[PDB]
UniProtKB/Swiss-Prot annotation:
The gene is BACE1. It is a single-pass type I membrane protein. GO terms for biological process: amyloid fibril formation; amyloid precursor protein catabolic process; amyloid-beta formation; amyloid-beta metabolic process; cellular response to amyloid-beta; cellular response to copper ion; cellular response to manganese ion; detection of mechanical stimulus involved in sensory perception of pain. One of its GO terms (molecular function) is amyloid-beta binding. The modification N6-acetyllysine is found at K70, K207, K211, K217, K231, K232, A239. Expressed at high levels in the brain and pancreas. In the brain, expression is highest in the substantia nigra, locus coruleus and medulla oblongata. Residues 1-371 are extracellular. This is Beta-secretase 1.
Length: 371
């Protein structure tokens, strides 16, 4: 409890390609790098020699593999994969010293799923059974982990924005954050759904009906890059950010994520860009707290050229890597709550820092949830 030195800095990645952890599947153990995803609930790994893959799960080499004789087809907005379901023994070498039997989707065919040039070969869906494919009877990895061992029912993530970080399975490491954790309820166990109750750009309340912030939901998602906002809310959001940054100028394509913007090095104009504050529903009636991020988070380096990493959504709010990179995030499943604290490793400058502050008084917070 409070210290897990063997799990610190167990995450790796490249900018724009996500955060992965080392895992092993099978007996004898086969090592794979696996993308950490709080926004889905399947453990799925490449199992055939797709050209983009450094390696893949070879079931024939595992004595502990059990076939479930069942297939799954998983289409996403743009990409898809299909696989064969089975179970096997799974470990996390820089995680707890346990081995569990978990469901695994052996990916046999995929389209626009694997990234050319990336160093990961599968995905670890850490969300709940409700959104597992093909249905909620396929037990997610973390559920199996907790069912089968003494690992406490929680994990935490420090995403450090080339990239790195920590996944603490079964606890919290207090070295990884400053100040206090502040918790928001998980509204429902499907995605890690939360409720946003107020939004400010540089102190300026958007003053929208707070229902709009969570239309049709708001989720915390390590498998998405952007801070994604409901269209109606995005429209208000950029309008205020554009106006806040009207000092200098960039094309209108930039704000729709349709083109990059560039400055010469040593001299990105950070200060003309506003901070973004999300107030989150608190643990107590009429009580909220707020988390604050920087352009460092929402203007993402591409290789000094940057993408604007806030975008509109038809799927609700998605607090992706743009948000999580400012914070140590505690997925306290046991108490159905999400904790945020200022990350010890977050990218900032000498003028502004990421912030987690409270308590604030906010009335009618339950009206903020969409139904
Ligand atoms: C299943 C699904 C999925 C499927 C495949 C890859 C990813 N993740 C990613 C890909 C490429 C770049 C990334 C950079 C970051 Cl920071 C984080 N995830 C990244 C996520 C669908 O999309 C949303 C979701 N939550 N999970
Ligand atoms: Na247990
Ligand atoms: Na601390």
């Amino acid at each position: 409890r409070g210290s897990f030195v063997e799990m610190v800095d167990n995450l790796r990645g490249k900018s724009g390609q996500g955060y992965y952890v080392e895992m092993t599947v099978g007996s004898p153990p086969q090592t794979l790098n696996i993308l950490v995803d709080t926004g889905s609930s399947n453990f799925a790994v490449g199992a055939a020699p797709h050209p983009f893959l450094h390696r893949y799960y070879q079931r024939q080499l595992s004595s502990t593999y059990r076939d479930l004789r069942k297939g799954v087809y998983v289409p996403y907005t743009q990409g898809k994969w299909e696989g064969e379901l089975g179970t096997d023994l799974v470990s996390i070498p820089h995680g707890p010293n346990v081995t569990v039997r978990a469901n695994i989707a052996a990916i046999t065919e995929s389209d626009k799923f694997f990234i050319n040039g990336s160093n990961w070969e599968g995905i670890l869906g850490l969300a709940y059974a409700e959104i597992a494919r093909p249905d909620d009877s396929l037990e997610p990895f973390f559920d199996s982990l907790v069912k089968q061992t003494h690992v406490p029912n929680l994990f935490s993530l420090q995403l450090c924005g080339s990239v790195g970080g920590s996944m603490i399975i079964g606890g919290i490491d207090h070295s990884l954050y400053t100040g206090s954790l502040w918790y928001t309820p998980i509204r429902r166990e499907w995605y890690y759904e939360v409720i946003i109750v107020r939004v400010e750009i540089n102190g300026q309340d958007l003053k929208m009906d707070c229902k709009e912030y969570n239309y049709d939901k708001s989720i915390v998602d390590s498998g998405t890059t952007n801070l994604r906002l409901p269209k109606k809310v995005f429209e208000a959001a950029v309008a205020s950010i554009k106006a806040a940054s009207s000092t200098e100028k960039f094309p209108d394509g930039f704000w729709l994520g349709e083109q990059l913007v560039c400055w010469q090095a040593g001299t990105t104009p950070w200060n003309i860009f506003p901070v973004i504050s999300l107030y989150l529903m608190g643990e107590v009636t009429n009580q909220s707290f707020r988390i604050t991020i920087l352009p460092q988070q929402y203007l993402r380096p591409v290789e000094d050229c940057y993408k604007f990493a806030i975008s509109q959504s038809s799927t609700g709010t998605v607090m992706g890597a743009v948000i999580m990179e400012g914070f140590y995030v505690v997925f306290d499943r046991a108490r159905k709550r999400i904790g945020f604290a200022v990350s010890a490793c977050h990218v900032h400058d000498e003028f502004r820092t990421a912030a987690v502050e409270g308590p604030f008084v906010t009335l009618d917070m339950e009206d903020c949830g969409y139904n």
